[PDB]
């Protein structure tokens, strides 16, 4: 019934964090946790396809996209399953993560278990930037920290 | 039909490694990769229940054991699903991992995706030691390095 997961974000720089996930049956996934070391403002935050840290965050591949859609914000019909929009860091570099999402899951075809969470250098423009890169990544830029999403007690 | 997984092992000390997994249909899981920084000799090697690195390797919990059995070697009827026996390092501290196992899986109820691989301080006694500890851990001792098992391309 109740499924839990966890993700420790690490990178080459100062950004680090711990993300928690909970899903009750086929309900929304509730995403919580804290990221530190960020620049003030909005940072893209997505599930990427592969739980592969062999080349740091690069080997996580693109956004998780089992329905073969273009990039959007989490409220858009046209989005990747992994598209969880932006987290916001305050003056102190701390982002408090508080997201509910209906497309990701912790079981079945939409499961993010064994995939990667990434937090980016720049704001995700939610697919509205009017260049091709917007339709793939939201122009969120480099991957500051990432972690493989694991099963939690 | 074909599933691939990967696991990057890290710890507090010098031990590191990369583990690859492949499962074609309901063939066995073929486990490969390299572990470095080990003392010469045998080191226990298991799937632990939780993909939780919030407290290093400690938070991975016990050996993955959905059938509530006693610890064993991979050839024993009585084993944990996660029991993959020992890997061996020579004088260079390098273990070349080469294992085939039919109880672990990369999908379904016995999936190890999102769980943790651990490499240990000591030899796994394969549950043959005459004490309670053998029946839980194989007397494999401390957890030198671990990582969350992720979905690979
Ligand atoms: Cu991303
Ligand atoms: Cu172990
Ligand atoms: Zn996207
Ligand atoms: Zn065991």
Enumerate domains of chain B plus CATH numbers.
2-151 (2.60.40.200)
Distance B23 CA to ligand 3 centre (A): 28
What residues in B contact A152, CB-CB < 8 Å? 50-52
* C-beta atoms of A53 and B151 within 8 A: no
According to DSSP H, which parts of chain B are helical? 132-137
Three-state secondary structure call for residue A130? coil
Long-range contacts of the stretch A130-139 (C-beta < 8 A, 24+):
A134/A71, A135/A70, A135/A71, A136/A62, A136/A63, A136/A70, A136/A71, A137/A44, A137/A62, A137/A63, A137/A71, A138/A44, A138/A71, A138/A83
Token pair recorded at residue A111: 């499961």
Token pair recorded at residue A27: 């309900």
Altogether, the residues listed in chain A come to a count of 153
Give the C-alpha separation, B47 to B85, whole Å. 10
B93 CB neighbour count, 10 Å cutoff: 14
Give the C-alpha separation, B11 to B55, whole Å. 11
Give the C-alpha separation, A9 to A31, whole Å. 14
Kindly state whether B54 is in contact with chain A, defined as any CB-CB distance less than 8 angstroms.
Answer: yes
DSSP string, A2-38: EEEEEEEEB-SSS-EEEEEEEEETTSPEEEEEEEESP
Residues of B labelled catalytic: 46, 48, 63, 71, 80, 83, 120, 143
Distance B115 CA to ligand 1 centre (A): 22
Exposed e or buried b for every residue in A28-67, given b needs 16+ CB within 10 A?
Answer: ebebebebbbbeeebbbbbbbbbbbbbeebebbbebbbee
Annotated binding-site residue? B80? yes
Solving technique for this entry? X-ray
Give the C-alpha separation, B93 to B108, whole Å. 35
Q: Which ligand is nearest to the CA of B144?
A: 2
Binding residues of A for Cu cation: 46, 48, 63, 120
Question: CA B95, B139, B54 angle in degrees (round to 5)?
Answer: 75
């Amino acid at each position: 019934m109740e499924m839990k997961a966890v993700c420790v974000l690490k990178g080459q720089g100062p950004v680090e964090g711990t993300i928690h996930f909970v899903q009750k049956g086929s309900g929304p996934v509730v995403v919580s946790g804290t990221i530190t070391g960020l620049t003030k403002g909005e940072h893209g935050f997505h599930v990427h396809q592969f739980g592969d840290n062999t080349q740091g965050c690069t080997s996580a591949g693109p956004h998780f996209n089992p329905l073969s859609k273009k990039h959007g914000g989490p409220k858009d019909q046209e989005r990747h399953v992994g598209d969880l929009g932006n987290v916001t860091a305050g003056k102190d570099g701390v982002a408090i993560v508080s997201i509910e999402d209906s497309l990701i899951a912790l079981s079945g075809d939409y499961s993010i278990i064994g995939r990667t969470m990434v937090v980016h250098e720049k704001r995700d423009d939610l697919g509205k930037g009017d260049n091709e890169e917007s339709t793939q990544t939201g122009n969120a830029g480099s991957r500051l920290a990432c972690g493989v999403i694991g099963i939690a007690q």
